[PDB]
Symmetry: C4
Subunit: 140 residues, 4 copies
């Protein structure tokens, strides 16, 4: 029996339970976005603004249900409408991470027919981050 650690074991939604995505694996996800005609977009956040929190609820009556702070991140430029080139997306990942080397960065994609985000995964975390585990240290 192995024990799932509660300490410094924060996750990041889709694909965070898999081994970290290689460049080849990221390119494959980008190909999938393009193949489906979805709209790629990059979003970023400083460390303090990365995980869901409750601070604004101090201002509320009994209306906190499904309200959380830090769901919104900051948009990198604009969604890439009309993008049919995976290399353009990869170049924007490089540009965003270069401009904000200490930020969390996630790649998302939108479907304008359902009008909903249809994919999303983390592509950068700050080097100072100490609040997560390697796959093989997730259980002790």
């Amino acid at each position: 029996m192995m024990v799932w650690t509660p300490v410094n074991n924060k996750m990041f939604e889709t694909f965070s339970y898999l081994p970290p995505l290689t460049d080849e694996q990221i390119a494959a996800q980008v190909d999938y976005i393009v193949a489906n005609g979805w709209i790629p977009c990059l979003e970023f956040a400083e460390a303090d603004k990365a995980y869901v929190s409750n601070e604004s609820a101090i201002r509320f009556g009994s209306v906190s249900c499904l309200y959380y702070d830090n769901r919104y991140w900051t948009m990198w430029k604009l969604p890439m409408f009309g993008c049919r080139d995976p290399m353009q997306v990869l170049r924007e990942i490089v540009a965003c991470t270069k401009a904000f080397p200490d930020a969390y960065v996630r790649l998302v994609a939108f479907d304008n027919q359902k009008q909903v985000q249809i994919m999303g995964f983390l592509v950068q975390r700050p080097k100072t981050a100490r609040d997560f585990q390697p796959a093989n240290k997730r259980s002790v």
Copy 2:
């Protein structure tokens, strides 16, 4: 007249007002669990999650009565159902404290007829803890 110190004098429920339990005294408590046919279990928590707090109440209407965060700790493996061997319990204490040397660890036991925890006491605190006093410094 001696004065009970209010400063860095945090307690830990059952047996925290006695001298710290020796290995022999811990073994005697484990024998008592086994003699009564209760279910031993270990639970642990990082320092920040060890004592009762109020943070989630920011999300509440007027319903905080008997709500506290940090009552639940994290289960080490599973409760030791069918355990009739005190040495097995003592070995799990060693294993748990080895895997989490910086955590608070408590031994508990369950009665499945009353369906309630029937015993409980601290077996480890982190070495960095400075929020408690030795027996002879609890009063000044």
Copy 3:
């Protein structure tokens, strides 16, 4: 025109706007307690528990009116019932401040006919305190 500074200028209720009390001035206040047959008592608090605050109100409905945390401090021993000796009070000030050299300490007195505290002033603040001004620096 001089300007009353808002920065690090915390006060401590009765007598805090006067020059700090000398040992002779403290002795005179003790004489007043004894002369009136009031009950002297010492109370103390660590720095974080010294000034009025709001933290418990996170648990409340709309009932915070005239509720503040940190109004209660910790009693040194017991109120000195029957005390007819000013020197006994001065000795307890020495004893309390010796036991808690980093605490805020205040001398209070009770009237049991009105059943209310009838005097009170600070007799010690921690040496590390940086949130108050000497008299000649309260205006700039």
Copy 4:
């Protein structure tokens, strides 16, 4: 496409999106106050009291609408009623910033006919402030 940075990019209301005001530009704003017969005044705040916050709302029922802490700053002396001399205002700026070199300081002016503040801009921030960007680093 340049990206407006969300990190350490705090603003300070009127004129904060322009290049920092030169001494000549400040003098011109003061001339404008005097020309219109408005009442000049200086206000200041320590760093922790400079930006709007919500802390007091812990005490509230459902009445936080348009309540914020830190809207009030501290008045330097009194508003300069009857002041028709721009050099007097500039000397008070010097005097205030000298007395409080580590404070935020803003120049304001009042109209007593409308009874409202009619102009306002920051004239000093503490040298330790690291939550703002120079004009050429606001976008990346």
